[PDB]
Input
Amino acid sequence: SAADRNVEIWKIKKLIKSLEAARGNGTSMISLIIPPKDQISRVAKMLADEFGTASNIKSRVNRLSVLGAITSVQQRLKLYNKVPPNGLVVYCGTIVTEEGKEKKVNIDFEPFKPINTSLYLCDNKFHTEALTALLSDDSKFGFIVIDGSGALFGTLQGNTREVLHKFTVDLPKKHGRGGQSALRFARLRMEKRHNYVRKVAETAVQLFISGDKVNVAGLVLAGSADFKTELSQSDMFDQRLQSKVLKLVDISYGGENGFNQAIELSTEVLSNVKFIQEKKLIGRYFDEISQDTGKYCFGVEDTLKALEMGAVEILIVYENLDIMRYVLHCQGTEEEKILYLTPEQEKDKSHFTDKETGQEHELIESMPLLEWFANNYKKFGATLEIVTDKSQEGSQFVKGFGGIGGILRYRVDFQGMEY
Amino acid sequence: PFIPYLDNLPNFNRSVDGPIRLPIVDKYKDMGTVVLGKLESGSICKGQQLVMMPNKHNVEVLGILSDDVETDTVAPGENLKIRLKGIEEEEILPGFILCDPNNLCHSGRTFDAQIVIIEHKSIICPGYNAVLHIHTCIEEVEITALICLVDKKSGEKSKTRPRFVKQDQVCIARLRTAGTICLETFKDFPQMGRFTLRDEGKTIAIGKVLKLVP
Amino acid sequence: IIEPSLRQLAQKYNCDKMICRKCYARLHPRAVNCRKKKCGHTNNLRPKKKVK
Amino acid sequence: VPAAARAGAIAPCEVTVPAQNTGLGPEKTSFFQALGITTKISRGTIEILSDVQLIKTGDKVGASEATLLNMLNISPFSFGLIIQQVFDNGSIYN
Amino acid sequence: YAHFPINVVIQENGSLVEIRNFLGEKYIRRVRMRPGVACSVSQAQKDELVLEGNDIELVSNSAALIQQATTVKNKDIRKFLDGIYVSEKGTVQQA
Amino acid sequence: EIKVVYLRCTGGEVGATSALAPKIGPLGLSPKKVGDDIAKATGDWKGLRITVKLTIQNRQAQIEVVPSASALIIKALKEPPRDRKKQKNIKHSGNITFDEIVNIARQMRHRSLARELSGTIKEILGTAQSVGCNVDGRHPHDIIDDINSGAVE
RNA sequence: GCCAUGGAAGUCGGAAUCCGCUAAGGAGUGUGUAACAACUCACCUGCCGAAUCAACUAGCCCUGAAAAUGGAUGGCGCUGG
Ligand SMILES: [Mg+2]
Ligand SMILES: [Zn+2]
Output
């Protein structure tokens, strides 16, 4: 399914960060990604001879890890019938962790989609970097920012915005020198401005060209007072590139905010991007907040209560978040219940106690909130919208409003409506 | 009429000797480097050592035309022409101001201000960017935290932290520029302090600069 | 721009109505059957959608 | 018991609206300034200058003229029980 | 009306009605009242027609004539709330 | 600013969910520390809910006990006190005495929130039926107990 | 209101559904509400004075009912037949 696919993209992102985080105290793990074409017999041959060699490495801890890891992966493939289709991930090792845990480890899996790596790595940590590279599939979009003040170059992923380079040039200004020069000032100044244009042009060729062929997918030129148009129409600007001029964008003051505005003018050009869909959705959500219609709902305290009652058209959530619900549980009455506690009251506080009875009150195995939405969103009837916290609106709503909220089915004025 | 009314009107702050300052408007090379700007504070006795701000370079001013006349001394509050013998030349900004080398002027990355929001118009959540306008100085800026709302008429500022603010509500807010930048106080210099909020074809807000974080 | 009384007045004559599911006709709000013969005095109505 | 003022029933006598503060923040002045009552912004908070009698003997109480009685919840004349005649063992008293 | 003001003028001592600048249209509506009807602009009111007469039928039909004459074609009427509308029906002298 | 407020509190037991900040919050005293102080001052009801009034000022709150009808009948019952959770299948088992109900009718008539004996026993027992009990029989029983077996002064 | 619950305080669920003034007032139809606010509902006084209201069923008529040379209750025509 498609919705389950997107759940795997975030789920895989979260799993990968862990596989990358685990560490050895002073030892090496074998990571072995086997590709789909090979035969098991051939793998057992290549490795059994590499095995008779690994038989005589000098170190004790490394040697035993290699030799024991080779026997383990063979036993894991003894579990695998054939090199399975579309890849084979394998991760054997001896990971130490906090609390002093000399832990042996074996993590074997058929991959979900085709995987290309033919990894072999006796190393301190595991590697699903292949998985995240496989997950992040969208082209990078460069941005050139020009101004009489100074330049700036920056790229643009699906959600993430990056900055590549920026610089200055001391182009002396219009007043320059009066009487004698003023009449021939605009001509000399246009030459000098064009020389600045040559330098900007050179940077765009450097960046956006790749062997007279663009490697990055899009290129958004940008400037004010017709800086970008000279860059577009200039002959230094490459013809194969004129074929692919995606857009030129005007800005004010000249810079990063203007870089952001030029992205806002782009919006319709980056329709495929979730960042653009987010910009448009959160643009409507702020239109709801501006208007009195009272569709908005906000905060986990109110939004989760609002979700429970229903009423929720769009539930805007950051894909990671890391906020939790403390499920309390009793012995006798069997009343499981969730509680949303602030940073002060959650960490150091005496509210998880029965007190009346005279006991300390526990909680039971929690669950992720986003995985819970994906599990039972059709039950509630709410449009889950996956946002990051990188973008100006997503990062903002993420920091202040818990990276969660929603457009409601109807009006609920909170200042009007006590309770 | 207008110019006769100026003749009958002497009501203007001369801007008199204080800690010497000179905000730099623009620059160019004509056998050196001339720059323009209104002396918001203090004096500058041409053959004398200045320092710029906030990047902080020592610098001697080669020549001046008080608007259109060669002079040695000058009091503040005047559109001055100032040609420098720059040791630092190409990483100077239009906007970095000269100050006294001893009586330095504050400048700072973090600062608080009472902003009166005219037209964002969207909600102004923590972390929006614009440009910060300080008469000659001008840097791109972001606001990290949003302290609180305040009324326009009879302004008694509230206790509890608000969750958001809509288009018009006035508020006290902290503004972080990208780089180092010339900021003054409303008490010390309002001429040095009153600043702008800026993005698209939309005026965001007026700003009221209060603090200078070092 | 315009007074809310005179607004609600135009709401009266244009927006506050009922529709026949069948012939998409326009009826008075406190109706029970349609008027048109082509639909057959249908009980099946709905209120006109209010503009936001 | 003084109940809410009705925006609609007939008036036996003149209904009155005394000069008294609203008890709110910045609100829409159009309800008071529509009719004809002097209302000033005494620093944010609105203050009433002059006293004017809106409704006369026998007049329909509008919602706008009703709103200030609904805010005060103070009837000029209370809903009640009116005496007709006394009757004592076959004896009428006017 | 919302934005464009409707310049109204009476011809033939309240028999005829010229209505100009409706939605900024160049067409102008020369509406004719019925016989035995007296159109009149009231005083002390900015936007107020007054139709007087004996026969209610002729009065009310002529009212609907002007009403349906000023009608918005091809547009969302729920939004564009323009045009003349009847407010208060009463008598010349009360009883 | 004085303000009275009704609260069907969990009792001596500290309730998880609170409805105190919406009514109390605008005035001034912190709502939860009062909720805990109210449950601590209460105590002997312990598990079951009590309608706690709160006369609130700008600085701080004031507590006043209002024993409910259903609550006073179940205390007449000897019940297990329980936590906020209040387990399922709590049908009350015992006998509400007719004299005890007359006493609770006197308690509600003392708060001055209902009728002369006929009405106040009924409101307290109609809520008792919500409790899930019997006054050695329901009102069909008490009609016969009333007839030729009256407990009236 | 208790039980549910987090809250059903008239308006998920689930337990409730007895009493008061009574002319009548549900632990509540909708808008609008987690429940109130604001608009609003069942129920009754004021006047009113004879027949009224609900659900079904079958009789006639109507809707449902579109095809190609110009067209057929046999035609003309027929509505106190
Ligand atoms: Mg159209
Ligand atoms: Zn129809």
